[PDB]
Structure 1
Amino acid sequence: LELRLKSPVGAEPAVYPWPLPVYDKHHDAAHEIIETIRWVCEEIPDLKLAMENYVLIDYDTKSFESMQRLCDKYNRAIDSIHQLWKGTTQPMKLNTRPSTGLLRHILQQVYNHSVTDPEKLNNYEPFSPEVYGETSFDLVAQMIDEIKMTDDDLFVDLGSGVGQVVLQVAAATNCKHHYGVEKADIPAKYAETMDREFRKWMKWYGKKHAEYTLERGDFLSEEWRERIANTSVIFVNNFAFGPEVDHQLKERFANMKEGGRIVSSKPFAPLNFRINSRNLSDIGTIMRVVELSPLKGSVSWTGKPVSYYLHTIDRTILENYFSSLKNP
C-alpha cells in the first residue's frame, strides 16, 4: 500500500508508504506531497492548467483513497504533459537552477527524509563549541543575494552540521566547488543522507546545482589551515564557538587572499576598529567588517533581530596606517 508521484522529468517516481509518516509537529508526508504537486505545477504552467480542473479541495490528508485520487490526478496530468512534449510543444527547460521558493521546499523535503530523529541533533555537550543550531533558509538566501559569487569563488561552511547551508548555496550559485566540514558524528552522519537525498530530489525535479562536498573533519586541523587560506567565501556560525576557537580561526583567516570574505554570527573583529600602536597584530587591521541588514521580522532569544556579519580581507587598511606613519 503506497502513494506514488511521477517525476516531471522522468526520474523514478517518489513512493510514500501508508499511513503517511509525520516528520515533526509541523511537517508530515501528506503535506509534503500536496506541496510537491503545488511546486511542480509552478515549474510547468501546462500542468497547472490540467490540475485546476476538478480539484476542489475534495481531499482529506487522513483518507488513503482521497490522497490516492490526488496523486493519480497529478500523475495523469504528468503523462499528458509528457505527450505534449512529444508533439511540437517545448519541454520544460532542463539543467536550470531552482527558484527560491522551490529550493525552500526541496531542502525541507530533503531534511524531512534525512533527519529521521531531529532530537539527536541536541545530544551535544552544552556550553561547548559543539553546540548545534541551524541558520535559517532566509538568512542564507540574504547572504547569497548580498555576496555576489562567481565561478571563480570557493565556498566553505566551517562547522556545517547536517549540511543544509552548503546545499542551498550550491543550488543557487555557480561557485567552482562548495564545501562543508563538520566534526561531530551525529550531524556528520545525517549529512551523508542529506547529500544523497538532495542529489536524488534535484534530479527528480530536473534542477541543476553546482559541485559540492560534505565532509567529516576538524576545521582547526593542519589539513584545513591551507584549505581555509584558499577559500574566497567562508560561512561560519560561530555564535557558540567561544574565544578559544574564534582565536584559532583568526590565525587561519589571516592567511586568506585579498577580497576574501567571511560571514558569521559573531564578528571576528570590532566594528569600531581603529589601528594604532597596540593592535598592529589584531585581525581588524586586515579586514572590513560590516553588519548585514536584519531580515524584517526575525528575532532570536536575545529579543533582538538575528545578527550576521560580513568580513572582507582588506590589507589596504594596514598599508594606509603605515603610510600615515610616514606622513607626517
Structure 2
Amino acid sequence: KLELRLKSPVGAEPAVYPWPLPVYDKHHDAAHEIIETIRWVCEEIPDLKLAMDYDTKSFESMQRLCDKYNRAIDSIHQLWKGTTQPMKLNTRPSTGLLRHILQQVYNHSVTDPETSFDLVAQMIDEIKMTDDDLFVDLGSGVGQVVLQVAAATNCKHHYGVEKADIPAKYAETMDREFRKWMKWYGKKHAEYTLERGDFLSEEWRERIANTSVIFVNNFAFGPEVDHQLKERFANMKEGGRIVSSKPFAPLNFRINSRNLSDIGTIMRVVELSPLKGSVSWTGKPVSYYLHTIDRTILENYFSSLKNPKLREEQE
C-alpha cells in the first residue's frame, strides 16, 4: 500500500490517495487533483505560497511534492501558534477555489459518465441574494449548481429536486464529498438539501409558490412541461425570480384582451448578458433569461381599461 497524503490547512483529516494514482476520466486524474489542491491551498495562505517541472508519473517525484507541501503546512500551523493570526475559518471560497472544490467532489462522487459553472457564477453576481431568499434548482442532476450557489450566497436555504434514480444517487454522494472537502479547506457554505422528487408534484406546487429564486434549465423542455411550470410560477410572490435557459414569456409582451391569463401579465422578462467565449452544443453563444414576478403590469392594464381615453387607444 504505497500512498500519498495531503494535510488539511485547517487540521481536518488528511486526503489519502493510493498509488498508483487513479484516473477519473479522460481529462482528470488524482495527480492533477493533488497538484491543483496544493496550488489552491497556496492561494488560501500567502505564507504557504511564499514557502513553495514535476513528473506526475514518478512516485518519488510526487512524494517530494507532497512532503514539501506537508512540511510547509506543519510549518504554517506552527507560525499560527505564535503571534501570527490563523486563517479566518468562517469564509466562503473564492470562485477559483470553489471551481476546484467542485471538480474535486465530482471526481470522487460520479464514477461513471461545468461551463455551467461559469454561467452560474455570472448569475450569482447579477442576481443579488440575501438571507431573505430561498433558492431552488428544478431538476438538479447530481447537484452541482445547488452546491455552487450554496457555497457562494446567503440564502436561508438551497434545495435541489431531481427525479431520476441515477443522478439522485450520485447526489447523495456529492453531498458527503462536498461537506467533507469544504471542511478540509476550512470554508463555509449556506444550508442546503438535495432531494429526490418530481417538481411537478403537488408537494412542489406549494414549495415553488414560496421560493424566491428558481433556477431551471428548461431549454429542451417540452410544451407540456413548460406550461405546467408556468402554472406553478403563477403562485409566486411579488419580486420572485426565475432564471432559465429558455424564457417562459415573451420579452416584449404587450398585454391585451386575448392574453389576460398568460404568465407575461405578471412578470418582467429580460435577457441576461451572455458569457464572452461561451458556445453551446448548438454553436450559438449562450443566453439566459431572468423573470421577476411583477403584478403592477396587470394592475396598470386594468387601470387603463377604466380610463375611456386609454381604453379607446388600445381599442
Secondary structure of the residue aligned to 1:241 is coil
Residues 19-57 of structure 1: CA deviation (Å, up to 9, x unaligned)? 111111111110010000000000101101111xxxxxx
Going from structure 1 to structure 2, the CA distance change for 1:181 and 1:135 (only over 3 Å counts) comes to: farther
CA contact (8 A) 1:95 1:206 kept: yes
- Output the aligned Cα RMSD: 0.8
Residues 17-26 or 289-298, more deviating? 17-26
SS in 2 for 1:136: helix
Q: Deviations over 1:210-261 (max 9, x none)?
A: 0000000100111000000000000000111211011001100000000000
Shift of 1:135: 6.2
Point out the more displaced range, 159-168 or 14-23.
14-23
Aligned to 2:311: none
CA distance in 2, matches of 1:27, 1:160: 23
Q: TM-score, normalised by structure 2?
A: 0.96
Corresponding residue SS for 1:60: coil
Shift of 1:162: 0.3
Matched residue pairs, number?
A: 306
Matched-pair contact (CA < 8 Å) for 1:135–1:165: no
> Which structure 2 residue ranges, 5 or more long, are not aligned?
309-315
CA deviation string 1:64-121 (max 9, x = no partner): 111011001000000000000011110001110000110111001001111111xxxx
Alpha carbons of 1:135 and 1:226: their partners in 2 closer, same or farther (altered >3 Å)? farther
Answer whether contact 1:22 1:29 (CA < 8 A) is retained: yes
User: What per-residue deviation string (whole Å, max 9, x for no partner) do you get for residues 166-206 of structure 1?
Assistant: 00000000100000000001110110110000000000000
Q: TM-score, normalised by structure 1?
A: 0.92
Task: Write the distance in 1 (CA, Å) between the matches of 2:271 and 2:118.
Answer: 16
Q: What is the deviation of 1:302?
A: 2.2
Counterpart of 2:14 in structure 1 is 13
Deviation at 1:280, TM superposition (A): 0.3
Q: Which runs of 4+ in 1 moved over 2 A?
A: none
Q: How far did 1:301 drift?
A: 2.4
- From 105, 118, 135, the counterpart of 2:100: 105
- Equivalent-residue separation in structure 1 for 2:247 and 2:167 (angstroms): 25
1:268-287 residue CA offsets vs partner (Å, 9 max, x unmatched): 00112110000000000000
Give the CA deviation at 1:300.
Answer: 1.3
Q: Secondary structure at the match of 1:34?
A: helix
- Counting aligned pairs with the same residue, the percent is 100
| CA distance in structure 2 between the aligned counterparts of 1:174 and 1:2, rounded to whole angstroms | 39
Q: Give secondary structure in 1 for the equivalent of 2:81.
A: coil
Q: Which runs of 5+ in 1 are unaligned?
A: 52-57, 118-133
